Design an enzyme around this catalytic site. Structure first.
Site, PDB file in Angstrom:
ATOM      1  N   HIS A 273       0.846  -1.226   0.000  1.00  0.00           N
ATOM      2  CA  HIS A 273       0.000   0.000   0.000  1.00  0.00           C
ATOM      3  C   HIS A 273       0.874   1.268   0.000  1.00  0.00           C
ATOM      4  CE1 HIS A 273      -3.344  -2.807   0.810  1.00  0.00           C
ATOM      5  NE2 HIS A 273      -3.976  -1.917   0.035  1.00  0.00           N
TER       6      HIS A 273
ATOM      7  N   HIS B  94       2.082   1.650  -5.726  1.00  0.00           N
ATOM      8  CA  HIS B  94       0.640   1.298  -5.859  1.00  0.00           C
ATOM      9  C   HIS B  94      -0.172   2.525  -6.304  1.00  0.00           C
ATOM     10  CE1 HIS B  94      -3.246  -0.575  -5.141  1.00  0.00           C
ATOM     11  NE2 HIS B  94      -3.517   0.368  -4.235  1.00  0.00           N
TER      12      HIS B  94
ATOM     13  N   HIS C  61      -5.527   7.708  -3.335  1.00  0.00           N
ATOM     14  CA  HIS C  61      -6.632   6.858  -2.796  1.00  0.00           C
ATOM     15  C   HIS C  61      -6.182   6.106  -1.540  1.00  0.00           C
ATOM     16  CE1 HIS C  61      -4.761   3.415  -4.762  1.00  0.00           C
ATOM     17  NE2 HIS C  61      -5.610   2.637  -4.117  1.00  0.00           N
ATOM     18  N   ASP C  62      -4.887   5.891  -1.340  1.00  0.00           N
ATOM     19  CA  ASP C  62      -4.361   5.098  -0.196  1.00  0.00           C
ATOM     20  C   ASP C  62      -3.380   5.939   0.631  1.00  0.00           C
ATOM     21  OD1 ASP C  62      -5.639   2.599  -0.023  1.00  0.00           O
ATOM     22  OD2 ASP C  62      -4.365   1.766  -1.639  1.00  0.00           O
TER      23      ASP C  62
ATOM     24  N   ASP D 128      -7.803  -0.127  -8.672  1.00  0.00           N
ATOM     25  CA  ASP D 128      -7.225  -0.544  -7.381  1.00  0.00           C
ATOM     26  C   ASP D 128      -6.774  -2.006  -7.445  1.00  0.00           C
ATOM     27  OD1 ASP D 128      -6.412   0.082  -4.826  1.00  0.00           O
ATOM     28  OD2 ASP D 128      -8.323  -0.629  -3.956  1.00  0.00           O
TER      29      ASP D 128
ATOM     30  N   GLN E 216      -6.202 -17.269  -3.776  1.00  0.00           N
ATOM     31  CA  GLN E 216      -6.179 -16.445  -5.023  1.00  0.00           C
ATOM     32  C   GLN E 216      -7.337 -16.854  -5.951  1.00  0.00           C
ATOM     33  OE1 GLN E 216      -3.531 -13.666  -6.048  1.00  0.00           O
ATOM     34  NE2 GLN E 216      -4.461 -13.713  -4.025  1.00  0.00           N
TER      35      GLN E 216
END
Ligand SMILES: Cn1c(N)nc2c3cccnc3ccc21
Ligand SMILES: [Mg+2]
Ligand SMILES: [Zn+2]
Length: 313
Positions: free
Chosen positions: A68, A72, A106-107, A217, A269
């Site tokens: 994060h 990213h 956004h993060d 994202d 996953q």
């Protein structure tokens, strides 16, 4: 005004593709983002001196966490750039300005922990924001950086245009809360299928922008296999650290986050591609046909994960 950023030939060509990897040279990422804004928006959208100051404050407020992080932020803004470029006429002047800034921000100030861990830890942010805890913090950090002196990249907008762009940014950052994605995709599904999906309806636009934010994202699942596989390691390095922190509060973590259960990751996953990724890009492809390459790449990586289980890698 006459100062175009240009990339080396391989970057100039590959940056247009959804599956582009921004590379390991951090010093180039700001220039990559500026190039994307100049082609997506115009060389006019942002006063370059303010934008460059905004980008460097934003970088400074991302933390050195495995996933994060700053890389990213720029990876997610590159996915938004590809969608916006392959859907030229569908988005307003202000939306294109706002959504690349939303994705970069956004993060902001992420610590590498979920909203669940903040709640069980009883972090001050969980008292201040009961739902979408980290996302309301990310938007809060965005507003702070925009209000630093020399950082208001939106100054040439009117009072009303200003409020519209910050509202676009806020909805866009809130929408990166995956807890909100499921309901948002289901409603977009029903609107597209019954045929009531109407892009002149602002509430319908919001929903579509939110699905795009989820798609951007998650875009690490849409890269070429060696990128997707190596990003999976950074992703699970944060999950396992969070699992370690759960055990510390005397809470056995979900197996996803337990570093003793690494053997269960490939199956985990599949679940994630089947439950989240494949539906996300399916519904987005049905709404925005030229984003099909994200669905195709996502499906290819699902196939690579099934091969890891079968034992063939
Ligand atoms: C549980 N989980 C969540 N919440 N996000 C992701 C994810 C996001 C990007 C790529 N791979 C991922 C694998 C698992 C994930
Ligand atoms: Mg987030
Ligand atoms: Zn993110």
């Amino acid at each position: 005004g006459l100062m175009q950023f240009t990339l080396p030939v391989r970057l100039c060509k590959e940056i247009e593709l959804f599956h582009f990897d921004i590379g390991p040279f951090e010093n180039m990422w700001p220039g990559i983002f500026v190039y994307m804004v100049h082609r997506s928006c115009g060389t006019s959208c942002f006063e370059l001196e303010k934008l460059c100051r905004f980008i460097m404050s934003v970088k400074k407020n991302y933390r050195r966490v495995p996933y994060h992080n700053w890389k990213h932020a720029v990876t997610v803004a590159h996915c938004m750039y590809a969608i916006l470029q392959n859907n030229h006429t569908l988005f307003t002047d202000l939306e294109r300005k706002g959504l690349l800034i939303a994705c970069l921000c956004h993060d902001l100030d992420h610590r590498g922990f979920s909203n669940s861990y903040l709640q069980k830890f009883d972090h001050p942010l969980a008292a201040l924001y009961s739902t979408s805890t980290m996302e309301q913090h990310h938007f809060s950090q965005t507003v702070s950086i925009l209000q630093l002196e020399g950082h208001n990249i939106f100054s040439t907008l009117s009072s009303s245009e200003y409020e519209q762009v910050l509202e676009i940014i806020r909805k866009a950052i809130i929408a990166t809360d995956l807890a909100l994605y499921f309901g948002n995709r289901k409603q977009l599904e029903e609107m597209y299928q019954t045929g009531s999906l109407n892009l002149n309806n602002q509430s319908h636009r919001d929903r579509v922008i939110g699905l795009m934010m989820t798609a951007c994202d998650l875009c690490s699942v849409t890269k070429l296999w060696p990128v997707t596989k190596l990003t999976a390691n950074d992703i699970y390095a944060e999950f396992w650290a969070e699992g370690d922190e759960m055990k510390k509060l005397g809470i056995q973590p979900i197996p996803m986050m337990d570093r003793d259960k690494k053997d269960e990751v490939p199956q985990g996953q599949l679940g994630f591609y089947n439950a989240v990724a494949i539906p996300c890009y399916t519904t987005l492809t049905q709404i925005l046909p030229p984003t099909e390459p994200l669905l195709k790449a996502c499906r290819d990586n699902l196939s690579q994960w099934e091969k890891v289980i079968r034992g063939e890698e």
